[PDB]
Amino acid sequence: EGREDPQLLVRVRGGQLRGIRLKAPGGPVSAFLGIPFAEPPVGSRRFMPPEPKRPWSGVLDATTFQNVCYQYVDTLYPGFEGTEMWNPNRELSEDCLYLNVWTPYPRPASPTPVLIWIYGGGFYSGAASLDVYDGRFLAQVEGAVLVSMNYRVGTFGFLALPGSREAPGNVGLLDQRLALQWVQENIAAFGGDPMSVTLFGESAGAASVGMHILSLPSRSLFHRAVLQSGTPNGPWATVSAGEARRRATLLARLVGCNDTELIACLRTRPAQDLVDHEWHVLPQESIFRFSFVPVVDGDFLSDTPEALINTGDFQDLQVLVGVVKDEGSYFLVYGVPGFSKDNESLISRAQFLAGVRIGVPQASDLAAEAVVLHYTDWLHPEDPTHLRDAMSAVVGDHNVVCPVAQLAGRLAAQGARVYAYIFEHRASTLTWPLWMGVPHGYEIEFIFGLPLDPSLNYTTEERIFAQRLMKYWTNFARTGDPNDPRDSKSPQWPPYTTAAQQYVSLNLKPLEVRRGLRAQTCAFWNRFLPKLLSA
Amino acid sequence: EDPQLLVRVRGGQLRGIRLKAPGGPVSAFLGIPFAEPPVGSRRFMPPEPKRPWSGVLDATTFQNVCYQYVDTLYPGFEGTEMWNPNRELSEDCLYLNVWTPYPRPASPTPVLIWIYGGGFYSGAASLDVYDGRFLAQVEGAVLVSMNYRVGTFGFLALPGSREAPGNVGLLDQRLALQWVQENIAAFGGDPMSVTLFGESAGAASVGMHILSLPSRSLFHRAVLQSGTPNGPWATVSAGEARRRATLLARLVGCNDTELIACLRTRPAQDLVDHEWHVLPQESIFRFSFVPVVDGDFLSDTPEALINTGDFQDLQVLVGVVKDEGSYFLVYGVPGFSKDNESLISRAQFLAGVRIGVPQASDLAAEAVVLHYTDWLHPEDPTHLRDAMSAVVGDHNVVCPVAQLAGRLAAQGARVYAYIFEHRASTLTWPLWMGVPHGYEIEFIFGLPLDPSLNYTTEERIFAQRLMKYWTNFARTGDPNDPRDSKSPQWPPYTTAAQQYVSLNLKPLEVRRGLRAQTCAFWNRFLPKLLSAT
């Protein structure tokens, strides 16, 4: 040391780190970027569970984001901001198990509650280093300690030959948990309070939070949870062991290969070869379906999430859960014919029927019919504008709105304190067409407080609005309650109950309380459809 | 000897009677035979035309009511009794009634023919709610009602047999329709402008005359109130008809000819006594002896013939009341009573659904419960009670009426649809039943215009509007007043716009969609569920 900033140097269990002093709009923050938390899961460690990071010598530099985990890159609208913002923004590498810490500057005085972010990306993509996951605003304005980790995605994180020892599955959830432990042991060196750790994530990230709630070894690593537009239950977040085994075998032939010999072969293929063939193993033409996701292994997941949700005891749990207005519109342009970001995607009755089989790829001819009958507007059963929005509503409801409604309903009936929201404000800065509404993933820039960056051309109310949600999210982190301890003038946010089924709307207007989580339509998806599909 | 009360039809001379309607007198010819009494060996057999008579036949009293089951549920209760037989029961009941203005119409006059309801097991053309004097005095119509054989006498069938070929109650109606052709001119009626209108089983009957070729030369326009030929209760297969016939024969002591013969030897009440015992399941809004799909009167199912027929020539006026299913619940489903408020448990609602949809599988019944549950209050007993009424109303009338309206429109026909939403101040059933099955009739026939009935002034004004709608539709195929301008016009129900109007004390209001979402379940999805459970 010597001439360095004395407040940027910190020790953790593996060595010394030098952070970096970043500017937030209202003051500096401390950032420790690219801390390793595991041995690089490369070579013979590919598909294996992560081992803890061996201690290093000297001062590790912790001032830039590390590699993002090896993953598919989106190429359907090259150069379009609406897709590039989610694409990797550092080098792709299998050496990628690193995490980031933002704290106030100088680091806080008392022990400060910790926020751990788990990104989404359908378990095949994502990075903790994207701009929309920037922690400097939450750390500066709310004084939070924010931690986000990289976990392995796609084949590297979730290809499983269940019951084998060289590919047990769920290693990407283990990656997440190892970062959670790392927070338990080390977050105190930054001012964070390991006794107040709140997980929050979106899409596959929310599902991940969900699975840490349902996996006993993870439950001693956090206290509160937030699930944004994602659930461990539902049709896309998990696969049986048999189905997981099926895809791993198929992918091994697609690249040219007793489980040991086969995994040994896969470990010789270039990472890009596996990415290149990852989507070819899906059983049907589908949207919102991902090849390699958490497997129900009888280990991390002792049973299916629906089983565990339906029976577990959750009185110690406090969760915030919610959805955006138009969860499914985003996914239509990635597979349903008739949809594009560039025209207005008015479709025909025929195209709606074809789309229902792609959006519900597991539906029998009869079940597919039920969906078509329930979602048709029988006064205008061929208005192409309404069949487009109905296609959007089918996919959104089936994959998010009703898996979340279902989860909120079970946890509430089983002891948990649930707070539920719908996010309805559509960012002025947004580059997707208007017909897509408020698409999947577009609350995140507001929770993280990006509109407080004046260089981002948001609007003033969008600024004020983002502070409102940062306050909601951090108050829930501190206390289990998003309501402000003081602020009694602004309206209150009731817990969600079986009785009153209350939830709030989040938009530029004050909190408005509503009832019913798409109650009628989710009864179709969560009660009738299962019984129909055993036939 | 008042010559306006003397008429010469082809079988002889009638004498009528002059009665007082509130604003003038009407000629009434009650009790005219149109068929040879179907008694003895003519039990179960097609009717034959009445033989000529000598002298001047007295047509001044209602004849007998066709032998039929008489309801016991609430003895002495008007809401029940008002549908019970008005006259002595008799298998000799094939008579019809004619009301005309007094004096007899100068020029030819459109004829309305009423076909009563009663589930094909009951009813009579002589109940007060079918009084033709108001329509004849106020709108100057000629109005004809006939009795037809109900229950085992009208509809017991051994398909293919000669001495019980089925549907003879409909042939009774058909015969009275030929009678009107050959004779109404003698009364001042126009045989070239005959409108059929009926309700419940009567509307179904009207519907079946639309679908049967011989009847199609006997009338020009049709009105179907709260009933349809299609649907779960109006017909039975030749298979299921034969089963109920030979089973009832067994419960009374009885080769087709040998079996029918032994049935023709039993007292009428021996047959009525076992009439309800032949239903396959425990049910509600199901009836043991109803028209049969015989490949003769009904060449195919009502559904097949509406799905594929040409109806460019047809003009129909179809409708429902607000609460079609509520009447029925007290006749079978535990928890429901005229007397309390029938707030029910959830489990009562699930049990009721098996009685309201007696042909439903476990999966289809769960589909019904899940679709009718209000999941914001899935246990609130007021909801489940109104839900139970609506499952029964939608399954048995509303969605069948909507199904009929849609196919007739799709295939050439001009269709007017209504929903009747006014509840009579005189009504004697509880409030929770709303506007129950049957309680628009008193208004269509103009009973509020009789002061002694203690209807309110707006109800009398209402009644006049509906009498205008129905008669106007009879003169022109169009219920709108050709002198009344004004924007609330009754639009034709079409496949695209799906417009219908509401009949209540407020002016005509146009709405769209005949309960289209939930009827999509009953008409499009539920068949697919059962046809592949």
UniProtKB/Swiss-Prot annotation, chain A:
Record's miscellaneous remark: Synapses usually contain asymmetric molecules of cholinesterase, with a collagen-like part disulfide-bonded to the catalytic part. A different, globular type of cholinesterase occurs on the outer surfaces of cell membranes, including those of erythrocytes.
Superkingdom of this protein's organism: Eukaryota
Keyword Secreted attached: yes
Role noted for this protein: Terminates signal transduction at the neuromuscular junction by rapid hydrolysis of the acetylcholine released into the synaptic cleft.
Catalyses which reaction(s): acetylcholine + H2O = choline + acetate + H(+)
Tissue specificity remark: Predominates in most expressing tissues except erythrocytes where a glycophospholipid-attached form of ACHE predominates.
Subcellular location field: Synapse; Secreted; Cell membrane
Keyword Membrane: yes
Entry-linked PANTHER family: ACETYLCHOLINESTERASE
Gene Ontology terms: biological process: acetylcholine catabolic process; acetylcholine receptor signaling pathway; cell adhesion; osteoblast development; positive regulation of cold-induced thermogenesis; receptor internalization; regulation of receptor recycling; retina development in camera-type eye
Protein species of origin: Mus musculus
Keywords: Cell membrane, Disulfide bond, Glycoprotein, GPI-anchor, Hydrolase, Lipoprotein, Membrane, Neurotransmitter degradation, Secreted, Serine esterase, Signal, Synapse
Pfam families from the UniProt entry: AChE_tetra, COesterase
Family recorded in the similarity comment: Belongs to the type-B carboxylesterase/lipase family.
Annotated membrane topology: Peripheral membrane protein
Protein EC: 3.1.1.7
Gene3D superfamilies reported in the protein's UniProt record: alpha/beta hydrolase
One Gene Ontology molecular-function label: acetylcholine binding
Cross-referenced InterPro entries: AB_hydrolase_fold (IPR029058), AChE-related_enzymes (IPR050654), AChE_tetra (IPR014788), CarbesteraseB (IPR002018), Carboxylesterase_B_AS (IPR019826), Carboxylesterase_B_CS (IPR019819), Cholinesterase (IPR000997)
The protein's name in its UniProt record: Acetylcholinesterase
Coiled coil: none
Major localization listed first in the record, in broad terms: other
Active site residues of this protein: 203 (acyl-ester intermediate), 327 (charge relay system), 440 (charge relay system)
GO cellular component: basement membrane; cell surface; extracellular space; Golgi apparatus; neuromuscular junction; perinuclear region of cytoplasm; plasma membrane; side of membrane
